[PDB]
Symmetry: D3
Subunit: 151 residues, 6 copies
């Protein structure tokens, strides 16, 4: 399961507050493999589909508008248990519940400005990756650090 992949996006607040490198560095130092990366301005149409599961929620409309309000950094990361572990590194949805050491615990205050999205499951990750990236934007490369991260 070392080829598992997750979709992460730095939300517009992360770009505006200059935390892109900080966030990328946390996934690098953890040992995951970066397999796709781009800075994009997502359309409302794409974001509506990205957050389809939340269409009934009262914040859906403002969440979509906000995620479209500025650039996001879309990413795919690969490694064993990357989906679950990425969620742990990011921390709870509401930063007030995310402990220090997590991204949201260290860098945010409020649920509407919580810096980053990560897929919530392997199935969501597959859907999100296909939605945001073409297949030719996902790169296979020989990772020399693999020998020192895996048994």
């Amino acid at each position: 399961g070392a080829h598992e992949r997750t979709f992460l996006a730095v939300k517009p607040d992360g770009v505006q507050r200059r935390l892109v490198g900080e966030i990328v560095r946390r996934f690098e130092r953890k040992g995951f493999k970066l397999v796709a990366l781009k800075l994009v301005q997502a359309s409302e149409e794409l974001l509506r589909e990205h957050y389809a599961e939340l269409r009934e929620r009262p914040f859906y409309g403002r969440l979509v508008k906000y995620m479209a309000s500025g650039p996001v950094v879309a990413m795919v990361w690969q490694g064993l248990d990357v989906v679950r572990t990425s969620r742990a590194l990011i921390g709870a949805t509401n930063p007030a519940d995310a402990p220090p050491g997590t991204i949201r615990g260290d860098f945010c205050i409020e649920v509407g400005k919580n810096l980053i999205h990560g897929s919530d499951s392997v199935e969501s990750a597959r859907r999100e990756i296909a939605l945001w990236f073409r297949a030719d934007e996902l790169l296979c490369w020989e990772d020399s650090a693999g020998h020192w991260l895996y048994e």
Copy 2:
């Protein structure tokens, strides 16, 4: 809500071990707004009042003497849920119980040298702010990061 304030003080051990910048930087990167700051030598009289609720505890007298033994950095920080969140950033009173990622978890060993004080509630914060600062030392400024920390 977002105008809530807490009182923090770097204790003399924090100054002596050169952790003032490190501590301030953790509150900055979290998103909170610095509204007051000074290096002072607090009197025993002020400290007796600051720690009034601990008058019956066996360590009261040495706690007061210690907090008066050297400079402290007094601070006020503003933001949503700043009192509770500041306590979480700092970690448990006893550093042995404070997880890594918190200030006391990362930087201290023993309860009598635990680097920093934060208000334990909104009501204590109001009392502590008034005790340590005059009203004209609390500054209102237009925070340009506000749009990216709050809805």
Copy 3:
């Protein structure tokens, strides 16, 4: 000329050594604006054109092959004097001549593994940007830090 842009690329050694976030963070903290970003595997054809001015140099062939051997992170950064200033942040071509504090001074040893490319002039930057990015990959966003970086 606050709208000046430069092309930067993290070379394969930078990706392999997990210094992408570190590098991006240095440009962020300096105040420059990230306007394009992607992880790509560049073709030999593109790299031959990228390094056209070096066609007569003895290392040209291996430089092309090497830059095509693995993923690169291509970037565009915007700000006053960004081309010249980025070169200063990166440091001399030969890391042995790059002082500590620069990227190559802090992280590299030898000229062939020197982590990063930056455009050497405004004219080179224009050519390099057009070569590596389509116009719709360069984003305009309203920068909230701008008031505090520029008069």
Copy 4:
């Protein structure tokens, strides 16, 4: 020795707004200098005109004053051997385009009008600037435990 030399430093409003107060303080701490005074204040135009009196004839004087008064500043006094000259080196050239990486301005700024921090340019300026911004009872003497490991 000259180990009791003092300098005046101020984080300018851009430094506060960009959340670089801790970063800046940390650089002076890790260098070994002793923090002897600190406060967050909103300086008046009158004080700033006097602070920058030597620049009254310069074309940017007016905008410099207005800007330094536009937001909170962190005023500081640091103590140590050669602290005035060495602080200037840590900060870097006035124009960030001339400040090398490793300096504060080299690492964190772009333009001369937004260059994060002020440091005294000489011992005499430092004495004047300290007196202008601080009362004597805001400068603290404390016994520095790291002193044995910074000095002979």
Copy 5:
């Protein structure tokens, strides 16, 4: 109990991934006292004895082979509750269970490459210290930070 000691070792993955400084720095900033340090290539015989309690486990053989595959940084740290607290800083054996903020939580993925060993009790620490170090490699020095870490 401020003279309690623990044995820590950076495993070969920690050396290869260049995390020795990072690891040492976390113990320094916590306040503990470094009392012994060396880079060694441990023999399989020593490692078999080190991990004697795990002789029946299925991974014993590969654990021994791996710990002998490269240099290790052997260390002794001294301070109040250093054994238990070191374990907390390192995090759970399986990095998937170690929260962000811990060494394994921040830097590792899998139990077979988990960066570092720490003694699990005072008695194990005594045994491990004697096994890896001669008495004349353990140094007593006067710690100037002690006044600011201990009541």
Copy 6:
């Protein structure tokens, strides 16, 4: 060439001020290979020999006494031009002349407390290595990062 070695020692001030990890990390991130490491309490006799060339200087006596006053971290690092480049990373003998970005420029004030020693030439390095280390304390290991630092 790439097998050149230098002797470095963190002086007692570096240990006391908790900068060992910070120092090691700078040599790691630069790309050099750690081939020996130990914490020792050097005798006055060894230090007199270490600094033999300075016997006539007025500060010789106090330099010896001071270097013997607490633990030092002795190290050997390997790589291309490591002797000269280590000196550049360390900075000028007198920290007042060492630019920010160097170890002494970032962390010290005065020549008598300047944190670290590095060999001043290849010949001094050979002498210093033999003086401080037995041959069996210098390790050969296969460095996986070498592919990304060297041609």
